[PDB]
Swiss-Prot record, chains A, B, C, D, E, F:
Disulphide bridges: none
Start and end residues of each stretch annotated as Catalytic site for iron oxidation: 53-60
Chief location category: cytoplasm
Record lineage: Eukaryota, Metazoa, Chordata, Craniata, Vertebrata
SUPFAM superfamilies: Ferritin-like
Residue numbers binding Fe cation: 53, 56-57, 60, 63
Coiled-coil boundaries: none
Gene: FTL
Protein name per its UniProtKB record: Ferritin light chain
Native source species: Equus caballus (Horse)
Length: 171, 171, 171, 171, 171, 171
């Protein structure tokens, strides 16, 4: 009955709504991460800012998906947004570990949506994922792995601290 | 055990977390409102934009509250965000009615938080509500009542349409 | 006993004070008109603005008269300002009808003051009315008649609405 | 029956209309003060200008109140504006005394409206008074007391004139 | 006998003079803190500068209070300023602890002045505290708690130093 | 035990701390002078401003001395700051008399510190006094004597007022 809908499976429509939920959950998680690091007894405002920026990116992804849902003539359906998995997020290392786990769950969701879009022969969907999501996730996951390595190095030892300072201050 | 906390009741702390939830729910509602009006079979993009702007304002209010929670040494606690009350929002009139009901529920929540802050002799809280929330809500509710009146006039009759056009095009 | 007073009758002096009162009453009326249209259940802000501008013009006329009274060595005397004739002003059509009636009462007052100034052989008074009031009133009354005609056309019928839209949007 | 009205008592609504009247009366008083000082036999144009500026401020206060009345869903009701208490205002000292008495009556009215708003648990009203009226009145009353002191000094004696000139011309 | 004084209790007048003393004491304390960190055998000029800026803020607060005292028609009365509690201030951690204790004593004084102003039904006083003092203190106390946490982290351990460097140099 | 200290007597060190106290007392006195002239019943804002500027200069002198104390490796020690000698300061003439007495006490203190520095063969101290204090005091004392003469002339008589006006308005 939708007058623009063409080659748009009910399966993809549903999976897109689920991915919106996944992205909004991710944004909520990053909001909680950021405010934790803003606590006076944590007080790492740069970490708060890093996570605040990610909450925004994740919300923007959801909005992009919702725009696409309408462009294809699907019906956006919203579900409860579950609260984040933790109320306190431990150290910078713990938080960046939780963040890469999250990004990896979104990345797997995008890959699963491509597999569905391929099975449904929906190239507009594939193009959309490619254009806005797949490379963005890979780039973000690389940066977070980079961060994990640096944090481990900085917290580990004077040899690690040493090499980090040399790179940052001499190079 | 918080080293900055002063004159900040556990009651207000809790009510602030609940109000964050209320504001994030409101933002989610407005996201659903906006995307509904973006549907090709609805296609009122200006309405989508009006509600998109409100989703942003409501999120910003929640973020402001969360910032304040930390500034007072309270602990931000997040809860499930319930999905909006409807999946489809009817006419522009229905949506603007749902929106004023929502804003009125937030306004009542702010008034209830002032009553608690007064009972707890917490003037920083009162000041904060005054500075960022009370007048903003009143102004928004006035605009929405204005909108309700105009929509009713425009949809009602040629006499109503007539007066609207005169004001918009002659005055 | 006034050392600048020349050729300035007590009759004109009195009539000038009465006209000040008439102009301030008019300004008060337009204040009430404008705020009525600002009511959320009326919500024609352009009409509010049109009347707000007229309240200003009418006050300025009174101030001009008061300045002139002093320039001639008359004594400005103020009287009670009666409240406007109505508390609610009905439709845009009703309000613009009330406004033209008002302007016509001021115009008749100016004409009556010219007749007195002529009988008193006071050409400075005539010049003053000509320079600041007579043409202003005529222009305003023409605009209001124009408005009455347009409002009647717009509220009347699809043929009227039709012609208005053609003029506004095509021409 | 007003669709925006929330937490807005009939008592405050009425007191706001009365305060509008009080502010418009004040503006009318200052108009009479200013024109008196413009009389050729008085000829203190700076005093005329000081009072003209106050007539404007007082009108603006009334307009602010009327805007607020509508924003809260109250009904602006206008009453007769009584003419000022005097037709001639004596010396600069007499006029500035009459002016501080007036400002003190408005200030007391604002304080009485806060007491009512507090009894009615209306924090938007309190905020509004704070934001636009309480500090403005205090500042104005301080300036007028300053003026009274200076006028008394200047009119009093050569020792007073002396100190005024030293401050104005040397410092 | 003061010609501007209205609704200004002798109790608030006295408490304002005491708070001026409290603020000037605070400014003197911060002067001593800053010069200590300027000692060649301490040599933390950034800490000296942080405290120099606070000495200025505290003096400005006192001056603001004194201005307000005169605006209300109270009489500014000055008392001995006691010298700071210490002649030497230990480590950066010790000094920032002494500073938050101080700010908390000023904050409690402001809250006690609000309680008095409320008991005296003095809304201009409440507004003044809100506008210039309550939020400023909260913001300053949050920053100092942030500083305490960071200093403890940096002085504590290589894991703490590690996380601080990551936030500052990577994020 | 100070590693920079050279040719810096304990006698000068102590006298510098005492002079800091003297300068801060002077600044406090000028704060009280300035606020007195800001009283509505005094209302000489130019006098308030003149004294406010001097309070700043005196504080700056103390800060300069404290900086120098550290540059020489002395230990800044702060004492109680006694409140000013009066709570009310009479006429402009009385205040300017009190001010020149004060400046003369500071000037004598500087001269006494030079005598000590000379006896201690401390040329850096002499240079410092010369560079920042001796000429500044002389210039300030000359200006204040000038002011005393003018105030006496202006308050004295029409012949005095006469000559002042001629100089200010014709020359
Ligand atoms: Au954050
Ligand atoms: Au942040
Ligand atoms: Au694909
Ligand atoms: Au595909
Ligand atoms: Au770097
Ligand atoms: Au570096
Ligand atoms: Au570096
Ligand atoms: Au939208
Ligand atoms: Au939109
Ligand atoms: Au409150
Ligand atoms: Au409160
Ligand atoms: Au329009
Ligand atoms: Au139009
Ligand atoms: Au038009
Ligand atoms: Au209006
Ligand atoms: Au308007
Ligand atoms: Au005529
Ligand atoms: Au004539
Ligand atoms: Au047009
Ligand atoms: Au048009
Ligand atoms: Au058009
Ligand atoms: Au005037
Ligand atoms: Au004037
Ligand atoms: Au209030
Ligand atoms: Au209130
Ligand atoms: Au001056
Ligand atoms: Au002068
Ligand atoms: Au001069
Ligand atoms: Au310093
Ligand atoms: Au410094
Ligand atoms: Au208060
Ligand atoms: Au209060
Ligand atoms: Au940094
Ligand atoms: Au760094
Ligand atoms: Au770096
Ligand atoms: Au001053
Ligand atoms: Au001043
Ligand atoms: Au010397
Ligand atoms: Au020497
Ligand atoms: Au001069
Ligand atoms: Au002159
Ligand atoms: Au002159
Ligand atoms: Cl955040
Ligand atoms: Cl495909
Ligand atoms: Cl939207
Ligand atoms: Cl409170
Ligand atoms: Cl208006
Ligand atoms: Cl004629
Ligand atoms: Cl005027
Ligand atoms: Cl209240
Ligand atoms: Cl310092
Ligand atoms: Cl109060
Ligand atoms: Cl001062
Ligand atoms: Cl020497």
């Amino acid at each position: 009955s939708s007058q623009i809908r063409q080659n748009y499976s009910t399966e993809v429509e549903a999976a897109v709504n689920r991915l919106v939920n996944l992205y909004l959950r991710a944004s909520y998680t990053y909001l909680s991460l950021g405010f934790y690091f803003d606590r006076d007894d944590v007080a790492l405002e740069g970490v708060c800012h890093f996570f605040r920026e990610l909450a925004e990116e994740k919300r923007e992804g959801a909005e992009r998906l919702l725009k696409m849902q309408n462009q294809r003539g699907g019906r956006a359906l919203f579900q409860d947004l579950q609260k984040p998995s933790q109320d306190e997020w431990g150290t910078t290392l713990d938080a960046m570990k939780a963040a890469i786990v999250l990004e990896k769950s979104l990345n797997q969701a995008l890959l699963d949506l491509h597999a569905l879009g391929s099975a449904q022969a929906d190239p507009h969907l594939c193009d959309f994922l490619e254009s806005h999501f797949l490379d963005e996730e890979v780039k973000l996951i690389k940066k977070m792995g980079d961060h994990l390595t640096n944090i481990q190095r900085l917290v580990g030892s004077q040899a690690g601290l040493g090499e980090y300072l040399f790179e940052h201050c001499t190079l």
